[PDB]
Structure formats: structure tokens, C-alpha cells
Write a protein that binds this ligand. Sequence first.
Ligand code: HEC
Length: 159
Amino acid sequence: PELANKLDPNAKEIDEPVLKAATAAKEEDGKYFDKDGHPTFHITNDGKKVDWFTYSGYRRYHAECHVCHGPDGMGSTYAPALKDSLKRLSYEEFYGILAGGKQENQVMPAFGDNKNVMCYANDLYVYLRARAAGAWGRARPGEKEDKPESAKTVEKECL
Ligand code: HEC
């Protein structure tokens, strides 16, 4: 139905198993979920329009993560490429690394005490999930879906 994606027909780096596991099964007010109950994306009109959290997660990524992890999750001299990471990592593995950090030299900081990051954890997951599935390229999202009212009142409370 309207839960289905419609991506770039000239999308050359799609990962079908990762994309299939990210198919939207449910929608609760601008928020999409997969059959496992975990957040997911929703691309529309041939790879140009994106759901709110993919849009929002891009911006939070550029703000708070791009420095060590490179543009579009491509990787850097000090940190791995998160577009490949979210092929293996489950939603809760990602959330735990983000909240508590990871070490080996090589340190990923714990962001748990950083509400400007933790309150957008689902946004970061969704966007980087869309990268891992090859459902979004290395562009900035243009057309988006409207920001839902649900997001604004929990953004209120979380911050
Ligand atoms: C500073 C440099 C940063 C910043 C600001 C962020 N990350 Fe994180 N990250 C970083 C390192 C050195 C590592 C590797 C740690 C190790 O080798 O043990 C990581 C790792 C991750 C992971 C797990 C990667 C994997 O195992 O595949 C995730 C997920 C991750 N980083 C995500 C992430 C996000 C969402 C950030 C947003 C603010 C972020 N990092 C910041 C170094 C750094």
C-alpha cells in the first residue's frame, strides 16, 4: 500500500536483504516501523521524497557524527563507515553503542548524557539504515514529508 517504498530505478548500490528487512509494516503518525517493531524509513516518488526521520537524521548526522565518520556514512581515517555498519548491527546494538560508546587508540564517545544526540537516536538509525539498504544515496534530502505532531511534543519533553 502506501507503506511501500518507491526508490530510484537507477539505484546501483541496493542491498536487497537489508532493504527487505527494512520494509515498512506499520505507521504511527509519520513514524514508520518494520515487522520487528523497529524504526525504518519510507522513500517515495522515485527516490526523491523521504520520510521525516530520514531527513531529520541526515541533519543530526552531519552535525554530530560526520566529523569522525565522514560524509554520508562513508568512513574516515579514524572511524568506520556507518553505511556498512547498519547491515550487521540491530537497532538495539546501535542504540547501546551510541549511548555507552565503544573502545578498541580508538574511542567512540558515549553520547548518553547528550540529549541533543540521544533524543534523535531514532532519526540517526533511520537515516543510516536507508544508507545501508542503498535506498538513499550520498545526497542531501530535498523533498520531505511533513514533520509530524508526535515528534514535536516528544522533542519538547526529551530536551
Ligand atoms: C569521534 C571521533 C566520533 C564521533 C563524534 C562519533 N563517532 Fe562513532 N565511532 C568512532 C570510533 C573511533 C568508532 C570505532 C570504535 C571501535 O573501533 O571500537 C566508532 C564506532 C561507531 C559505531 C559502531 C561501528 C561498528 O562497530 O560497526 C557506531 C554505530 C557509531 N560509531 C555511530 C556514531 C554515531 C551515530 C555518531 C553520531 C553522533 C557517532 N558515532 C559519533 C568515533 C566517533
